[PDB]
Fold this protein.
Amino acid sequence: GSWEIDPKDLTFLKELGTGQFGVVKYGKWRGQYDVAIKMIKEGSMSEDEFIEEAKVMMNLSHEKLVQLYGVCTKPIFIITEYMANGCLLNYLREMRHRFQTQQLLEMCKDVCEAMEYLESKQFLHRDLAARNCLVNDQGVVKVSDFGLSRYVLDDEYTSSVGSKFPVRWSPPEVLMYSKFSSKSDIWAFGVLMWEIYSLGKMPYERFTNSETAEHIAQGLRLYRPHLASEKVYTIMYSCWHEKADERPTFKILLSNILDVMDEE
Ligand SMILES: Cc1cc(-c2ccnc(Nc3cnn(C)c3)n2)ccc1CNC(=O)N1CC(OC(C)C)C1
């Protein structure tokens, strides 16, 4: 099929790590083109549902999305774009980079462009956070594994009380009522900007998940990272309005980030 990649066209070269579905490896497709290969461990994925949605994910084409090239469905494999510099979260925590804030702003812009595109397709990421962003050889950040949360069978990940749930990237109405929308992706983007300007600090670093959920339920918020200007903090803070309707769109966040870039 159009979505299906012949696994005999793959050459496995390096292990990259382990995620919710198991090992990811680096390799080549037809001897020439770098790819990342997710080897989906048995029982970790609702596979038939994912296969049908891979038809829609293939067509989600934006330069700031980590592209899904295809799937191996005859473990099943997911074949994606390769990002030489790995995960954004680990990238931010490498102090050797000595990032300027203009560089941090450009990572935010990168992610916001991917997400303005997904929102234009009415497609929700559902687990946006720095761990689900990757960095290529030119320092470009792209958004990875968008939509994949729907096919995770692990109950610790899919329940809002589970140990693996993205509590610290979740708006109040997700934590209280499981009400997901474009505005929960907005909430998580603001936490992501906070992670970037915090150089990979855990949000609510001194709190448990349970204490975070009570905190944000009482109206309390993350506060300004040392490297965020007042204008940058205003942008991320706009994402955390208690009323989902009063949060910006990604088109509006993109205009604000572009505005501020004119100041560095
Ligand atoms: C290990 C790994 C590598 C990659 C990957 C892809 C492309 N390029 C590179 N490059 C690179 C260079 N160095 N390193 C170390 C990596 N890496 C992508 C994901 C993962 C693991 N997460 C995972 O699979 N998840 C599915 C998602 O599910 C939730 C959203 C529900 C989280």
Notes: The domain at 88-261 is CATH 1.10.510.10 (Transferase(Phosphotransferase); domain 1). The two ends are 48 Å apart (CA to CA).
